[PDB]
Amino acid sequence: VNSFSGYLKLTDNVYIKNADIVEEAKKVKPTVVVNAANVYLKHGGGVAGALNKATNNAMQVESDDYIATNGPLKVGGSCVLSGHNLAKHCLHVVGPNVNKGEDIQLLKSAYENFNQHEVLLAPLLSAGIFGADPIHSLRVCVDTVRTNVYLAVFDKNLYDKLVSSFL
Ligand SMILES: Nc1nc(N2CC3(CCC3)[C@@](F)(C(=O)O)C2)c2c(n1)[nH]c1cc(F)ccc12
């Protein structure tokens, strides 16, 4: 039993809700919240900008130190950093950005990072400003992640489309 409330169950291990991931994280304090990061951990907009803003920019400060030490992530890769006031940990995962021409096949590799964590609160990778089809992203998530994933979808309209078209 865990503290996630109001989710619709899609499969044995994947759950979905219409929610703001910032507010969902603030209330649940999950062990892991996933950020839709870029390789530079520049959290300017989308989910990343919203998560970072909710941390009063502490996420960005920590991220800049991480990059200065380690260099950029790989597309499809991840790193574990602090969850600040939102979660114990933040798993920064880089899905391919279609608006940069990145290979969508890397979306599966991105979701594989979730399997290193028993339970996660996460957005749909490569959705939103990353330009991928959220329905495809959900399919890859379901077919790749084996651990327990609670997906937060900000837009009510897209949420309904994702549920209604789910196979
Ligand atoms: N550009 C942008 N995309 C965001 N996504 C990307 C998205 C996937 C489909 C498009 C999303 F809309 C959704 O799940 O419906 C969330 C958020 C955001 N800005 N600010 C936010 C603040 C939050 F608390 C949570 C999510 C976002």
Side-chain angles (χ1 to χ4, degrees):
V1 180
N2 64 50
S3 158
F4 290 103
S5 179
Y7 284 76
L8 176 67
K9 182 172 178 61
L10 293 175
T11 67
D12 177 62
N13 65 298
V14 178
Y15 295 79
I16 194 164
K17 186 185 184 175
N18 175 215
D20 183 339
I21 192 173
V22 170
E23 279 318 299
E24 189 77 4
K26 273 198 290 201
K27 143 182 135 43
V28 178
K29 286 299 225 83
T31 305
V32 180
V33 68
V34 172
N35 182 32
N38 58 54
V39 296
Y40 306 110
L41 299 183
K42 288 173 60 107
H43 309 302
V47 168
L51 289 171
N52 176 59
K53 178 177 174 189
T55 75
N56 183 44
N57 211 51
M59 178 180 283
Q60 191 63 69
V61 167
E62 178 194 30
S63 292
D64 288 348
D65 171 85
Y66 173 91
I67 297 287
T69 299
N70 301 108
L73 294 184
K74 300 170 181 178
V75 179
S78 69
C79 67
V80 180
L81 291 173
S82 181
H84 300 278
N85 53 317
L86 305 176
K88 187 174 200 294
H89 300 110
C90 180
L91 180 71
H92 295 272
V93 179
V94 184
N97 190 322
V98 176
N99 305 315
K100 302 172 175 179
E102 293 168 352
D103 166 25
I104 195 55
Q105 300 301 133
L106 289 169
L107 187 53
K108 188 171 181 76
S109 302
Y111 274 117
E112 287 170 342
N113 296 286
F114 289 25
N115 290 321
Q116 299 294 317
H117 304 277
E118 288 192 359
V119 182
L120 315 87
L121 171 62
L124 284 170
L125 297 180
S126 296
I129 67 175
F130 280 63
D133 178 357
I135 298 179
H136 175 66
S137 182
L138 180 54
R139 185 75 257 162
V140 179
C141 179
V142 157
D143 293 341
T144 305
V145 181
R146 298 175 303 281
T147 54
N148 295 142
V149 57
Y150 288 83
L151 294 166
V153 177
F154 180 57
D155 186 65
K156 173 57 161 156
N157 189 295
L158 171 60
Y159 171 83
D160 288 346
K161 183 197 190 102
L162 286 168
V163 169
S164 294
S165 62
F166 185 70
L167 223 198

Short mmCIF file of all heavy atoms in Angstrom, two decimals, residues 32-35 37-39 41 43 62-63 66-67 70-71 73-74 76-82 89-94 113 117:
data_model
loop_
_atom_site.label_atom_id
_atom_site.label_comp_id
_atom_site.label_asym_id
_atom_site.label_seq_id
_atom_site.Cartn_x
_atom_site.Cartn_y
_atom_site.Cartn_z
N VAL A 32 10.54 8.92 -5.33
CA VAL A 32 11.13 9.36 -6.60
C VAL A 32 10.10 10.13 -7.40
O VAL A 32 9.02 9.59 -7.70
CB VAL A 32 11.65 8.18 -7.44
CG1 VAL A 32 12.25 8.69 -8.74
CG2 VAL A 32 12.66 7.35 -6.66
N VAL A 33 10.43 11.36 -7.79
CA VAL A 33 9.73 12.08 -8.85
C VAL A 33 10.64 12.14 -10.06
O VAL A 33 11.84 12.39 -9.93
CB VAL A 33 9.25 13.48 -8.41
CG1 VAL A 33 10.40 14.45 -8.16
CG2 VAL A 33 8.31 14.04 -9.45
N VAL A 34 10.08 11.87 -11.24
CA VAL A 34 10.84 11.94 -12.49
C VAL A 34 10.71 13.33 -13.08
O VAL A 34 9.60 13.87 -13.21
CB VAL A 34 10.34 10.89 -13.49
CG1 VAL A 34 10.98 11.09 -14.85
CG2 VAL A 34 10.57 9.48 -12.95
N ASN A 35 11.85 13.89 -13.48
CA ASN A 35 11.89 15.12 -14.26
C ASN A 35 12.13 14.80 -15.72
O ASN A 35 12.94 13.93 -16.06
CB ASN A 35 13.00 16.04 -13.76
CG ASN A 35 13.05 17.33 -14.51
OD1 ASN A 35 12.02 17.84 -14.96
ND2 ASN A 35 14.26 17.88 -14.67
N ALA A 37 13.99 15.92 -18.19
CA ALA A 37 15.19 16.72 -18.30
C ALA A 37 15.72 16.77 -19.73
O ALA A 37 15.36 15.96 -20.59
CB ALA A 37 16.25 16.12 -17.38
N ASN A 38 16.62 17.73 -19.96
CA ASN A 38 17.50 17.71 -21.13
C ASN A 38 18.92 17.38 -20.67
O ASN A 38 19.20 17.30 -19.47
CB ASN A 38 17.41 19.02 -21.92
CG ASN A 38 17.76 20.23 -21.09
OD1 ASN A 38 18.83 20.30 -20.48
ND2 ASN A 38 16.86 21.22 -21.08
N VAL A 39 19.80 17.14 -21.64
CA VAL A 39 21.14 16.64 -21.33
C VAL A 39 21.95 17.62 -20.52
O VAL A 39 22.90 17.20 -19.84
CB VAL A 39 21.93 16.22 -22.58
CG1 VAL A 39 21.27 15.05 -23.28
CG2 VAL A 39 22.20 17.38 -23.52
N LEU A 41 20.64 19.52 -18.15
CA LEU A 41 19.88 19.79 -16.93
C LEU A 41 19.56 21.28 -16.82
O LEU A 41 19.61 21.86 -15.73
CB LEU A 41 20.60 19.27 -15.68
CG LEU A 41 20.86 17.76 -15.62
CD1 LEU A 41 21.51 17.37 -14.30
CD2 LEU A 41 19.57 16.97 -15.83
N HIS A 43 16.69 23.58 -16.69
CA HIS A 43 15.28 23.36 -16.38
C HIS A 43 14.46 24.62 -16.67
O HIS A 43 13.96 25.29 -15.77
CB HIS A 43 15.13 22.95 -14.93
CG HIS A 43 16.03 21.82 -14.53
ND1 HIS A 43 16.03 20.59 -15.15
CD2 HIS A 43 16.99 21.77 -13.58
CE1 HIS A 43 16.95 19.83 -14.59
NE2 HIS A 43 17.54 20.51 -13.63
N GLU A 62 21.71 22.74 -7.88
CA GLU A 62 22.28 21.41 -7.74
C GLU A 62 22.67 20.84 -9.10
O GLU A 62 23.71 20.19 -9.24
CB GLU A 62 21.25 20.52 -7.05
CG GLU A 62 21.70 19.11 -6.88
CD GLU A 62 20.56 18.18 -6.51
OE1 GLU A 62 19.42 18.45 -6.94
OE2 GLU A 62 20.81 17.15 -5.84
N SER A 63 21.81 21.05 -10.09
CA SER A 63 22.04 20.52 -11.43
C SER A 63 23.28 21.14 -12.07
O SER A 63 24.06 20.45 -12.74
CB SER A 63 20.83 20.78 -12.32
OG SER A 63 19.71 20.01 -11.88
N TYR A 66 26.23 19.46 -10.73
CA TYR A 66 26.34 18.12 -11.31
C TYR A 66 26.98 18.18 -12.70
O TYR A 66 27.87 17.39 -13.01
CB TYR A 66 24.95 17.45 -11.40
CG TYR A 66 25.01 16.12 -12.15
CD1 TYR A 66 25.22 14.92 -11.50
CD2 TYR A 66 24.92 16.11 -13.53
CE1 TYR A 66 25.33 13.72 -12.24
CE2 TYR A 66 25.03 14.97 -14.26
CZ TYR A 66 25.24 13.78 -13.61
OH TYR A 66 25.37 12.64 -14.36
N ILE A 67 26.51 19.08 -13.56
CA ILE A 67 27.04 19.17 -14.92
C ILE A 67 28.49 19.65 -14.91
O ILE A 67 29.31 19.18 -15.71
CB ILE A 67 26.15 20.08 -15.79
CG1 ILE A 67 24.73 19.51 -15.95
CG2 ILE A 67 26.83 20.37 -17.15
CD1 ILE A 67 24.64 18.32 -16.85
N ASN A 70 30.37 16.43 -14.02
CA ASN A 70 30.19 15.20 -14.79
C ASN A 70 29.97 15.39 -16.27
O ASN A 70 30.04 14.41 -17.02
CB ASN A 70 28.99 14.42 -14.22
CG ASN A 70 29.19 14.08 -12.76
OD1 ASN A 70 28.56 14.64 -11.87
ND2 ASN A 70 30.11 13.19 -12.51
N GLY A 71 29.70 16.61 -16.73
CA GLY A 71 29.32 16.83 -18.11
C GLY A 71 27.89 16.41 -18.37
O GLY A 71 27.19 15.92 -17.48
N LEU A 73 24.37 14.67 -19.63
CA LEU A 73 23.80 13.33 -19.77
C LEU A 73 23.76 12.93 -21.24
O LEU A 73 23.98 13.75 -22.14
CB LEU A 73 22.39 13.30 -19.19
CG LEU A 73 22.25 13.52 -17.69
CD1 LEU A 73 20.80 13.36 -17.28
CD2 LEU A 73 23.11 12.65 -16.84
N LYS A 74 23.47 11.65 -21.47
CA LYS A 74 23.12 11.12 -22.78
C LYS A 74 21.62 11.23 -22.99
O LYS A 74 20.84 11.08 -22.04
CB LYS A 74 23.50 9.63 -22.87
CG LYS A 74 24.98 9.36 -22.66
CD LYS A 74 25.28 7.89 -22.50
CE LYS A 74 26.75 7.65 -22.26
NZ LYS A 74 27.02 6.22 -22.07
N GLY A 76 18.41 9.53 -23.56
CA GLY A 76 18.08 8.19 -23.11
C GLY A 76 18.62 7.89 -21.73
O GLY A 76 18.26 6.85 -21.16
N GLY A 77 19.48 8.76 -21.19
CA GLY A 77 20.08 8.53 -19.89
C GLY A 77 19.39 9.27 -18.76
O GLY A 77 18.36 9.91 -18.93
N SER A 78 19.99 9.17 -17.58
CA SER A 78 19.40 9.72 -16.37
C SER A 78 20.46 9.93 -15.31
O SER A 78 21.58 9.39 -15.38
CB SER A 78 18.32 8.80 -15.81
OG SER A 78 18.86 7.60 -15.28
N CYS A 79 20.09 10.72 -14.31
CA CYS A 79 20.85 10.78 -13.07
C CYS A 79 19.89 10.99 -11.92
O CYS A 79 18.80 11.53 -12.09
CB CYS A 79 21.92 11.88 -13.11
SG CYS A 79 21.23 13.56 -13.15
N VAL A 80 20.31 10.55 -10.73
CA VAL A 80 19.54 10.72 -9.50
C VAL A 80 20.13 11.89 -8.73
O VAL A 80 21.32 11.89 -8.40
CB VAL A 80 19.56 9.46 -8.62
CG1 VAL A 80 18.76 9.69 -7.33
CG2 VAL A 80 19.01 8.28 -9.37
N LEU A 81 19.29 12.88 -8.43
CA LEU A 81 19.68 14.01 -7.62
C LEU A 81 18.64 14.17 -6.52
O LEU A 81 17.72 13.36 -6.38
CB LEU A 81 19.83 15.27 -8.49
CG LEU A 81 21.01 15.25 -9.47
CD1 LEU A 81 21.00 16.45 -10.40
CD2 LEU A 81 22.35 15.20 -8.72
N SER A 82 18.79 15.22 -5.72
CA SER A 82 17.84 15.47 -4.65
C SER A 82 16.44 15.75 -5.19
O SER A 82 16.27 16.36 -6.25
CB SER A 82 18.28 16.68 -3.84
OG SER A 82 17.37 16.92 -2.78
N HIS A 89 14.01 11.89 -3.84
CA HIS A 89 14.93 11.92 -4.96
C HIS A 89 14.21 12.43 -6.19
O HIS A 89 13.01 12.20 -6.36
CB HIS A 89 15.42 10.51 -5.29
CG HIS A 89 16.14 9.85 -4.17
ND1 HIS A 89 15.63 8.79 -3.45
CD2 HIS A 89 17.34 10.14 -3.61
CE1 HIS A 89 16.49 8.44 -2.51
NE2 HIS A 89 17.54 9.25 -2.59
N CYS A 90 14.96 13.08 -7.08
CA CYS A 90 14.50 13.36 -8.43
C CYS A 90 15.33 12.55 -9.40
O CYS A 90 16.56 12.68 -9.43
CB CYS A 90 14.60 14.84 -8.76
SG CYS A 90 14.03 15.21 -10.45
N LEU A 91 14.67 11.71 -10.19
CA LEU A 91 15.31 11.02 -11.30
C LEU A 91 15.15 11.89 -12.55
O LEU A 91 14.05 12.01 -13.10
CB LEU A 91 14.68 9.64 -11.48
CG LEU A 91 15.27 8.81 -12.61
CD1 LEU A 91 16.68 8.34 -12.27
CD2 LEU A 91 14.38 7.63 -12.93
N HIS A 92 16.23 12.52 -12.97
CA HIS A 92 16.24 13.35 -14.19
C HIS A 92 16.46 12.41 -15.36
O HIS A 92 17.52 11.78 -15.47
CB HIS A 92 17.37 14.37 -14.10
CG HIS A 92 17.19 15.36 -13.01
ND1 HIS A 92 16.48 16.53 -13.18
CD2 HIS A 92 17.60 15.35 -11.73
CE1 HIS A 92 16.48 17.20 -12.05
NE2 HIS A 92 17.15 16.50 -11.14
N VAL A 93 15.46 12.29 -16.23
CA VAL A 93 15.51 11.37 -17.36
C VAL A 93 15.40 12.17 -18.64
O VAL A 93 14.51 13.02 -18.77
CB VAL A 93 14.39 10.31 -17.30
CG1 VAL A 93 14.47 9.39 -18.53
CG2 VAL A 93 14.43 9.53 -16.00
N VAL A 94 16.29 11.89 -19.59
CA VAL A 94 16.32 12.60 -20.87
C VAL A 94 15.65 11.72 -21.92
O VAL A 94 16.24 10.77 -22.42
CB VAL A 94 17.74 12.98 -21.29
CG1 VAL A 94 17.67 13.79 -22.57
CG2 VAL A 94 18.42 13.77 -20.20
N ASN A 113 15.29 3.55 -17.54
CA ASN A 113 15.82 4.09 -16.29
C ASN A 113 14.83 3.93 -15.14
O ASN A 113 15.23 3.82 -13.98
CB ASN A 113 16.18 5.57 -16.44
CG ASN A 113 17.30 5.79 -17.43
OD1 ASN A 113 18.44 5.50 -17.12
ND2 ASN A 113 16.99 6.27 -18.63
N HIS A 117 14.00 1.80 -10.00
CA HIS A 117 13.27 2.36 -8.86
C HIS A 117 11.95 1.63 -8.71
O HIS A 117 11.21 1.48 -9.68
CB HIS A 117 13.05 3.86 -9.06
CG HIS A 117 14.33 4.57 -9.27
ND1 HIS A 117 15.14 4.95 -8.23
CD2 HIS A 117 15.02 4.82 -10.41
CE1 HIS A 117 16.25 5.48 -8.72
NE2 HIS A 117 16.21 5.40 -10.03
#
